[model samples]
Target: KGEELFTGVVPILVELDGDVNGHKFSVRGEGEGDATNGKLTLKFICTTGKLPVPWPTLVTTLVQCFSRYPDHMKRHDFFKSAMPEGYVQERTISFKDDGTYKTRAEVKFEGDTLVNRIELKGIDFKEDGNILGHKLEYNFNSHNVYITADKQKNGIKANFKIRHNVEDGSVQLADHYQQNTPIGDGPVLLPDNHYLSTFSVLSKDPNEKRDHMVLLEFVTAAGI
Candidate 1:
Protein backbone atom coordinates (compact mmCIF):
# COMPACT_ATOMS: atom_id res chain seq x y z
CA LYS A 1 0.00 0.00 0.00
CA GLY A 2 1.38 3.42 -0.93
CA GLU A 3 1.18 6.06 1.77
CA GLU A 4 -0.42 9.31 0.73
CA LEU A 5 1.75 12.40 0.79
CA PHE A 6 0.10 15.77 1.11
CA THR A 7 0.61 17.91 -1.96
CA GLY A 8 0.40 21.70 -1.96
CA VAL A 9 -0.11 23.82 1.11
CA VAL A 10 -1.87 21.79 3.77
CA PRO A 11 -3.18 23.48 6.90
CA ILE A 12 -2.19 22.03 10.25
CA LEU A 13 -2.26 22.82 13.96
CA VAL A 14 0.22 21.73 16.61
CA GLU A 15 0.18 21.98 20.40
CA LEU A 16 3.17 21.70 22.68
CA ASP A 17 3.92 22.18 26.38
CA GLY A 18 7.10 23.11 28.12
CA ASP A 19 8.67 25.12 30.95
CA VAL A 20 10.30 28.52 30.65
CA ASN A 21 12.55 29.34 33.57
CA GLY A 22 10.75 26.94 35.92
CA HIS A 23 7.33 28.35 34.99
CA LYS A 24 5.30 25.75 33.16
CA PHE A 25 3.95 26.97 29.87
CA SER A 26 1.73 25.85 27.01
CA VAL A 27 2.03 26.64 23.30
CA ARG A 28 -0.58 26.17 20.62
CA GLY A 29 -0.72 27.61 17.13
CA GLU A 30 -2.18 27.18 13.65
CA GLY A 31 0.18 26.50 10.77
CA GLU A 32 -0.29 25.68 7.10
CA GLY A 33 2.47 24.13 5.12
CA ASP A 34 3.51 20.81 3.72
CA ALA A 35 4.18 18.12 6.25
CA THR A 36 7.74 18.34 7.66
CA ASN A 37 8.36 21.72 6.09
CA GLY A 38 7.20 25.31 6.77
CA LYS A 39 7.21 28.21 9.23
CA LEU A 40 5.74 28.32 12.72
CA THR A 41 4.46 31.12 14.96
CA LEU A 42 3.85 30.19 18.58
CA LYS A 43 2.75 31.95 21.74
CA PHE A 44 4.39 31.04 25.02
CA ILE A 45 2.03 31.59 27.93
CA CYS A 46 2.80 30.87 31.53
CA THR A 47 0.42 28.29 32.92
CA THR A 48 1.36 27.28 36.47
CA GLY A 49 2.54 30.56 38.01
CA LYS A 50 3.47 34.16 37.28
CA LEU A 51 6.32 34.27 34.80
CA PRO A 52 9.23 36.19 36.20
CA VAL A 53 9.87 39.60 34.75
CA PRO A 54 12.88 40.17 32.44
CA TRP A 55 12.62 36.53 31.49
CA PRO A 56 13.92 35.70 28.01
CA THR A 57 10.77 33.84 27.12
CA LEU A 58 10.46 35.47 23.73
CA VAL A 59 13.88 34.28 22.72
CA THR A 60 13.02 30.86 24.01
CA THR A 61 9.78 30.92 22.06
CA LEU A 62 11.54 31.65 18.77
CA VAL A 63 14.15 28.98 19.36
CA GLN A 64 11.57 26.33 19.99
CA CYS A 65 9.48 27.35 16.98
CA PHE A 66 12.35 27.18 14.49
CA SER A 67 13.54 23.88 15.90
CA ARG A 68 10.29 22.38 14.67
CA TYR A 69 11.32 23.03 11.06
CA PRO A 70 15.07 22.89 10.93
CA ASP A 71 15.03 21.21 7.55
CA HIS A 72 12.39 23.45 6.02
CA MET A 73 13.68 26.76 7.34
CA LYS A 74 17.15 26.16 6.04
CA ARG A 75 15.76 25.92 2.52
CA HIS A 76 13.31 28.79 2.73
CA ASP A 77 13.69 31.45 0.08
CA PHE A 78 14.03 34.15 2.71
CA PHE A 79 17.22 32.59 3.93
CA LYS A 80 18.36 32.01 0.37
CA SER A 81 17.72 35.59 -0.64
CA ALA A 82 19.74 36.83 2.31
CA MET A 83 22.92 36.07 0.48
CA PRO A 84 24.63 39.21 -0.69
CA GLU A 85 25.08 37.61 -4.07
CA GLY A 86 21.39 36.79 -4.19
CA TYR A 87 21.86 33.17 -5.18
CA VAL A 88 20.43 30.07 -3.55
CA GLN A 89 21.89 26.61 -3.66
CA GLU A 90 19.70 24.12 -5.41
CA ARG A 91 21.30 21.20 -3.58
CA THR A 92 23.40 20.88 -0.48
CA ILE A 93 25.24 18.05 1.18
CA SER A 94 26.16 17.78 4.81
CA PHE A 95 27.83 14.95 6.65
CA LYS A 96 25.73 13.41 9.36
CA ASP A 97 26.92 11.76 12.54
CA ASP A 98 25.99 8.35 11.21
CA GLY A 99 28.66 8.40 8.52
CA THR A 100 26.19 9.40 5.90
CA TYR A 101 25.51 12.55 3.92
CA LYS A 102 22.14 14.25 3.84
CA THR A 103 20.98 16.23 0.85
CA ARG A 104 18.58 19.16 0.80
CA ALA A 105 17.18 20.87 -2.25
CA GLU A 106 16.39 24.52 -3.01
CA VAL A 107 14.92 26.43 -5.88
CA LYS A 108 17.50 27.53 -8.39
CA PHE A 109 17.60 31.28 -8.81
CA GLU A 110 18.75 31.84 -12.36
CA GLY A 111 19.14 35.57 -12.80
CA ASP A 112 21.53 37.73 -14.72
CA THR A 113 22.78 39.38 -11.54
CA LEU A 114 26.42 38.55 -11.45
CA VAL A 115 27.89 38.39 -7.96
CA ASN A 116 31.41 39.09 -6.82
CA ARG A 117 34.03 36.47 -6.11
CA ILE A 118 32.07 34.70 -3.43
CA GLU A 119 31.84 30.99 -2.98
CA LEU A 120 28.18 30.14 -2.49
CA LYS A 121 28.90 26.93 -0.67
CA GLY A 122 31.37 28.20 1.91
CA ILE A 123 29.43 31.29 2.81
CA ASP A 124 28.26 31.07 6.42
CA PHE A 125 24.85 32.60 6.00
CA LYS A 126 22.91 33.46 9.15
CA GLU A 127 19.39 34.78 9.61
CA ASP A 128 20.60 37.27 12.19
CA GLY A 129 23.89 39.08 12.43
CA ASN A 130 25.58 42.45 11.90
CA ILE A 131 25.36 43.64 8.31
CA LEU A 132 27.15 46.99 8.74
CA GLY A 133 27.69 47.26 12.48
CA HIS A 134 23.95 47.28 13.02
CA LYS A 135 22.67 44.09 14.60
CA LEU A 136 20.20 42.20 12.40
CA GLU A 137 16.74 42.18 13.90
CA TYR A 138 14.39 39.21 14.11
CA ASN A 139 17.13 36.65 14.30
CA PHE A 140 15.18 33.40 14.32
CA ASN A 141 18.04 30.93 14.07
CA SER A 142 18.85 32.27 10.58
CA HIS A 143 15.68 30.84 9.03
CA ASN A 144 13.87 34.11 8.50
CA VAL A 145 15.79 37.24 7.54
CA TYR A 146 13.42 40.12 8.22
CA ILE A 147 11.80 39.44 11.58
CA THR A 148 11.24 42.40 13.92
CA ALA A 149 11.53 42.02 17.69
CA ASP A 150 9.99 44.53 20.04
CA LYS A 151 9.64 44.64 23.81
CA GLN A 152 5.99 44.58 24.75
CA LYS A 153 4.41 45.79 27.98
CA ASN A 154 3.38 42.29 29.03
CA GLY A 155 6.14 40.46 27.21
CA ILE A 156 8.18 40.50 24.04
CA LYS A 157 6.39 41.01 20.76
CA ALA A 158 8.02 39.65 17.60
CA ASN A 159 6.45 40.56 14.30
CA PHE A 160 6.73 38.66 11.03
CA LYS A 161 4.25 40.48 8.79
CA ILE A 162 6.58 42.71 6.83
CA ARG A 163 9.06 39.93 6.26
CA HIS A 164 6.77 37.82 4.14
CA ASN A 165 7.60 37.07 0.49
CA VAL A 166 4.11 36.63 -0.91
CA GLU A 167 5.14 37.56 -4.41
CA ASP A 168 6.53 34.09 -5.00
CA GLY A 169 3.18 32.47 -4.19
CA SER A 170 4.39 31.40 -0.77
CA VAL A 171 2.05 32.45 2.02
CA GLN A 172 3.67 34.19 4.97
CA LEU A 173 2.46 34.45 8.55
CA ALA A 174 1.71 38.14 8.08
CA ASP A 175 -0.85 37.42 5.39
CA HIS A 176 -2.53 34.88 7.64
CA TYR A 177 -2.96 37.35 10.52
CA GLN A 178 -4.91 39.87 8.47
CA GLN A 179 -7.04 37.17 6.89
CA ASN A 180 -7.90 35.51 10.22
CA THR A 181 -8.09 38.43 12.67
CA PRO A 182 -11.53 38.78 14.25
CA ILE A 183 -13.59 41.97 14.42
CA GLY A 184 -12.10 43.59 17.56
CA ASP A 185 -9.07 41.82 18.97
CA GLY A 186 -6.56 44.66 18.60
CA PRO A 187 -3.47 44.28 16.42
CA VAL A 188 -2.15 40.75 16.12
CA LEU A 189 0.76 40.31 18.45
CA LEU A 190 3.85 38.80 16.80
CA PRO A 191 4.36 36.22 19.48
CA ASP A 192 0.62 35.67 19.52
CA ASN A 193 0.55 35.80 15.73
CA HIS A 194 -0.24 32.60 13.89
CA TYR A 195 0.11 31.84 10.21
CA LEU A 196 1.05 29.14 7.75
CA SER A 197 4.04 29.53 5.43
CA THR A 198 4.66 27.50 2.29
CA PHE A 199 6.67 27.20 -0.92
CA SER A 200 6.36 25.41 -4.26
CA VAL A 201 8.79 22.70 -5.18
CA LEU A 202 9.27 20.14 -7.90
CA SER A 203 7.96 16.78 -6.90
CA LYS A 204 10.32 13.93 -6.27
CA ASP A 205 7.62 11.36 -6.83
CA PRO A 206 7.66 10.16 -10.39
CA ASN A 207 3.92 9.56 -10.46
CA GLU A 208 2.85 13.13 -9.79
CA LYS A 209 4.80 15.17 -12.25
CA ARG A 210 4.19 18.72 -11.20
CA ASP A 211 5.18 21.48 -8.83
CA HIS A 212 3.36 21.66 -5.51
CA MET A 213 3.06 24.37 -2.94
CA VAL A 214 3.67 22.59 0.31
CA LEU A 215 2.08 24.30 3.30
CA LEU A 216 2.74 24.30 7.02
CA GLU A 217 0.44 25.97 9.52
CA PHE A 218 1.94 27.65 12.60
CA VAL A 219 -0.24 28.82 15.46
CA THR A 220 0.44 29.48 19.12
CA ALA A 221 -2.94 29.08 20.72
CA ALA A 222 -3.94 31.43 23.52
CA GLY A 223 -3.36 29.92 26.93
CA ILE A 224 -5.04 30.48 30.27
Candidate 2:
Protein backbone atom coordinates (compact mmCIF):
# COMPACT_ATOMS: atom_id res chain seq x y z
CA LYS A 1 0.00 0.00 0.00
CA GLY A 2 1.07 3.69 -0.48
CA GLU A 3 1.16 4.65 3.18
CA GLU A 4 -2.19 5.86 4.58
CA LEU A 5 -2.23 9.44 5.90
CA PHE A 6 -3.97 9.92 9.25
CA THR A 7 -4.82 12.49 11.95
CA GLY A 8 -3.64 11.00 15.28
CA VAL A 9 -1.19 8.27 16.33
CA VAL A 10 -0.18 6.38 13.20
CA PRO A 11 0.39 2.68 13.64
CA ILE A 12 4.05 2.01 14.53
CA LEU A 13 6.28 0.09 12.14
CA VAL A 14 4.43 -3.18 12.30
CA GLU A 15 6.79 -4.83 9.82
CA LEU A 16 10.20 -4.21 8.28
CA ASP A 17 12.88 -5.92 6.13
CA GLY A 18 16.13 -5.15 4.28
CA ASP A 19 19.50 -3.62 5.25
CA VAL A 20 21.14 -0.17 5.85
CA ASN A 21 23.32 0.14 2.76
CA GLY A 22 20.55 2.29 1.31
CA HIS A 23 20.46 0.32 -1.90
CA LYS A 24 17.06 -1.39 -1.69
CA PHE A 25 14.16 -1.81 0.73
CA SER A 26 10.40 -2.26 1.23
CA VAL A 27 8.51 -0.75 4.18
CA ARG A 28 4.86 -0.47 5.21
CA GLY A 29 2.40 0.58 8.01
CA GLU A 30 -1.29 1.37 8.65
CA GLY A 31 -3.49 3.95 10.37
CA GLU A 32 -5.19 3.37 13.74
CA GLY A 33 -6.88 6.63 14.67
CA ASP A 34 -9.96 7.55 12.57
CA ALA A 35 -9.10 6.11 9.18
CA THR A 36 -9.46 2.48 10.14
CA ASN A 37 -12.15 0.91 12.27
CA GLY A 38 -9.54 0.36 14.99
CA LYS A 39 -7.83 -1.99 12.56
CA LEU A 40 -4.08 -2.01 11.84
CA THR A 41 -2.31 -3.78 8.98
CA LEU A 42 1.16 -3.69 7.41
CA LYS A 43 3.96 -5.45 5.51
CA PHE A 44 7.52 -4.58 4.46
CA ILE A 45 9.38 -6.66 1.88
CA CYS A 46 12.83 -5.98 0.38
CA THR A 47 15.38 -8.32 -1.17
CA THR A 48 17.19 -9.15 -4.36
CA GLY A 49 14.97 -12.23 -4.59
CA LYS A 50 14.45 -11.41 -8.22
CA LEU A 51 10.69 -11.65 -8.66
CA PRO A 52 8.89 -13.66 -11.38
CA VAL A 53 11.24 -16.44 -10.29
CA PRO A 54 8.75 -19.22 -9.70
CA TRP A 55 5.58 -19.97 -7.70
CA PRO A 56 4.58 -22.42 -4.93
CA THR A 57 7.81 -21.92 -2.86
CA LEU A 58 7.69 -18.13 -2.97
CA VAL A 59 3.92 -18.21 -2.68
CA THR A 60 3.90 -20.66 0.19
CA THR A 61 6.83 -18.92 1.87
CA LEU A 62 5.04 -15.61 1.76
CA VAL A 63 1.85 -17.06 3.20
CA GLN A 64 3.73 -18.87 5.94
CA CYS A 65 5.75 -15.79 6.85
CA PHE A 66 2.70 -13.57 7.30
CA SER A 67 0.72 -16.29 9.03
CA ARG A 68 3.51 -16.65 11.57
CA TYR A 69 4.28 -12.95 12.21
CA PRO A 70 1.64 -12.25 14.91
CA ASP A 71 3.02 -14.95 17.13
CA HIS A 72 6.58 -14.20 16.12
CA MET A 73 6.30 -10.56 17.12
CA LYS A 74 4.56 -11.38 20.38
CA ARG A 75 7.45 -13.56 21.49
CA HIS A 76 10.29 -11.38 20.24
CA ASP A 77 11.06 -8.12 22.10
CA PHE A 78 11.85 -6.46 18.76
CA PHE A 79 8.29 -7.14 17.75
CA LYS A 80 6.64 -7.21 21.18
CA SER A 81 7.28 -3.50 21.69
CA ALA A 82 5.84 -2.68 18.28
CA MET A 83 2.64 -4.74 18.43
CA PRO A 84 2.14 -4.70 22.18
CA GLU A 85 1.21 -7.72 24.28
CA GLY A 86 -2.10 -9.31 25.18
CA TYR A 87 -3.83 -8.63 21.89
CA VAL A 88 -5.27 -10.37 18.86
CA GLN A 89 -3.75 -9.90 15.39
CA GLU A 90 -4.83 -11.03 11.94
CA ARG A 91 -4.03 -10.77 8.19
CA THR A 92 -5.66 -11.71 4.88
CA ILE A 93 -5.17 -11.53 1.11
CA SER A 94 -7.70 -12.62 -1.50
CA PHE A 95 -6.56 -13.85 -4.87
CA LYS A 96 -8.98 -16.00 -6.91
CA ASP A 97 -10.37 -18.48 -4.46
CA ASP A 98 -7.24 -20.59 -4.85
CA GLY A 99 -4.67 -17.81 -4.74
CA THR A 100 -5.57 -15.68 -1.73
CA TYR A 101 -3.96 -16.00 1.74
CA LYS A 102 -5.06 -15.05 5.25
CA THR A 103 -4.20 -15.49 8.99
CA ARG A 104 -5.86 -14.45 12.27
CA ALA A 105 -4.96 -14.94 15.91
CA GLU A 106 -5.19 -13.54 19.47
CA VAL A 107 -2.08 -13.34 21.69
CA LYS A 108 -1.67 -12.75 25.42
CA PHE A 109 0.00 -14.42 28.35
CA GLU A 110 -2.89 -16.50 29.71
CA GLY A 111 -4.10 -14.02 32.37
CA ASP A 112 -3.10 -10.64 30.93
CA THR A 113 -6.01 -8.22 31.15
CA LEU A 114 -5.46 -6.50 27.82
CA VAL A 115 -6.52 -6.86 24.16
CA ASN A 116 -5.12 -5.86 20.77
CA ARG A 117 -5.54 -6.70 17.06
CA ILE A 118 -3.95 -6.29 13.57
CA GLU A 119 -4.65 -7.07 9.86
CA LEU A 120 -3.24 -6.48 6.33
CA LYS A 121 -3.80 -6.86 2.53
CA GLY A 122 -1.85 -6.56 -0.77
CA ILE A 123 -2.15 -7.22 -4.53
CA ASP A 124 -0.60 -7.48 -8.09
CA PHE A 125 3.23 -7.40 -7.68
CA LYS A 126 3.06 -10.48 -5.49
CA GLU A 127 0.66 -13.36 -5.13
CA ASP A 128 -2.89 -13.70 -6.39
CA GLY A 129 -4.20 -13.14 -2.87
CA ASN A 130 -1.33 -14.17 -0.64
CA ILE A 131 0.26 -11.75 1.85
CA LEU A 132 2.58 -14.27 3.42
CA GLY A 133 5.51 -11.88 3.42
CA HIS A 134 3.29 -9.02 4.61
CA LYS A 135 1.52 -8.67 7.99
CA LEU A 136 0.75 -6.45 11.01
CA GLU A 137 0.33 -6.61 14.85
CA TYR A 138 -0.76 -4.58 17.90
CA ASN A 139 0.14 -4.36 21.63
CA PHE A 140 -2.71 -3.69 24.06
CA ASN A 141 -0.39 -2.95 26.97
CA SER A 142 1.78 -0.21 25.49
CA HIS A 143 0.47 2.76 23.52
CA ASN A 144 2.47 1.57 20.48
CA VAL A 145 5.98 0.78 19.33
CA TYR A 146 8.08 2.74 16.89
CA ILE A 147 9.37 0.23 14.39
CA THR A 148 11.57 0.23 11.29
CA ALA A 149 13.56 -2.02 8.90
CA ASP A 150 16.79 -1.17 7.13
CA LYS A 151 18.27 -3.36 4.39
CA GLN A 152 22.04 -3.08 4.60
CA LYS A 153 23.75 -4.68 1.67
CA ASN A 154 26.04 -3.64 -1.20
CA GLY A 155 27.19 -0.81 1.06
CA ILE A 156 23.77 0.83 0.82
CA LYS A 157 20.85 1.25 3.20
CA ALA A 158 17.27 1.30 2.08
CA ASN A 159 14.63 2.42 4.58
CA PHE A 160 10.88 1.89 5.03
CA LYS A 161 9.69 4.58 2.68
CA ILE A 162 8.92 4.71 -1.03
CA ARG A 163 10.19 8.15 -1.92
CA HIS A 164 13.15 8.79 0.38
CA ASN A 165 13.83 12.17 -1.14
CA VAL A 166 17.32 13.51 -0.49
CA GLU A 167 19.89 15.99 -1.83
CA ASP A 168 20.52 13.57 -4.67
CA GLY A 169 17.22 14.73 -6.17
CA SER A 170 16.09 11.22 -6.99
CA VAL A 171 12.39 10.76 -6.49
CA GLN A 172 13.08 7.76 -4.24
CA LEU A 173 16.25 8.48 -2.32
CA ALA A 174 16.26 5.40 -0.12
CA ASP A 175 16.02 3.18 -3.17
CA HIS A 176 18.56 5.25 -5.01
CA TYR A 177 21.09 7.37 -3.05
CA GLN A 178 21.27 9.65 -0.02
CA GLN A 179 20.47 13.33 -0.54
CA ASN A 180 20.86 16.33 1.78
CA THR A 181 21.46 14.08 4.78
CA PRO A 182 24.66 12.25 5.57
CA ILE A 183 25.37 9.31 3.30
CA GLY A 184 25.85 7.07 6.27
CA ASP A 185 24.52 3.55 6.69
CA GLY A 186 21.03 4.68 7.87
CA PRO A 187 19.02 6.48 10.55
CA VAL A 188 19.73 6.28 14.27
CA LEU A 189 17.23 3.77 15.70
CA LEU A 190 17.03 5.72 18.95
CA PRO A 191 13.89 6.42 20.95
CA ASP A 192 13.51 9.65 18.97
CA ASN A 193 13.50 7.83 15.65
CA HIS A 194 11.17 5.19 16.96
CA TYR A 195 8.12 6.53 18.78
CA LEU A 196 4.34 6.30 18.82
CA SER A 197 3.95 10.07 18.52
CA THR A 198 6.97 11.34 16.54
CA PHE A 199 7.21 10.90 12.77
CA SER A 200 10.32 10.15 10.69
CA VAL A 201 10.85 12.41 7.72
CA LEU A 202 12.33 12.22 4.18
CA SER A 203 11.64 14.66 1.38
CA LYS A 204 11.96 15.08 -2.35
CA ASP A 205 10.98 18.66 -1.59
CA PRO A 206 10.64 20.05 1.92
CA ASN A 207 8.15 22.66 0.70
CA GLU A 208 5.80 19.97 -0.62
CA LYS A 209 3.17 18.20 1.44
CA ARG A 210 4.47 15.55 3.85
CA ASP A 211 3.01 12.60 2.02
CA HIS A 212 3.69 14.08 -1.38
CA MET A 213 7.43 14.17 -0.70
CA VAL A 214 8.05 10.70 0.71
CA LEU A 215 8.79 12.21 4.15
CA LEU A 216 7.34 9.53 6.44
CA GLU A 217 9.89 7.07 7.81
CA PHE A 218 9.17 4.44 10.46
CA VAL A 219 12.43 2.53 10.23
CA THR A 220 15.57 4.33 11.39
CA ALA A 221 18.88 4.00 9.52
CA ALA A 222 22.24 4.53 11.23
CA GLY A 223 25.21 3.05 9.42
CA ILE A 224 27.47 0.87 11.48
Q: Can you give the TM-score per candidate against the true fold? A: 0.23, 0.21
TM-score, cand. 1 vs. native: 0.23
lDDT of candidate 2? 0.24
lDDT by residue (tens digit), candidate 1, 44-70 = 333334422211212222111222223
**Per-candidate local distance difference test:** 0.24, 0.24
Q: Model 2, 1-224: lDDT tens per residue? A: 11112223343333223221122232332222222223233332223443222222111112101111222232222222222222233333333322322333343222321222222222333332122222211101111222333323211121222222222332211111111111133222211223222233322444633222122323211222
Residue 180's lDDT in candidate 2: 14
Best by TM-score: 1
Clashes of each: 19, 35
Which residue runs of candidate 2 sit more than 4 Å off their true CA positions?
Answer: 1-11, 16-45, 48-86, 91-94, 104-224
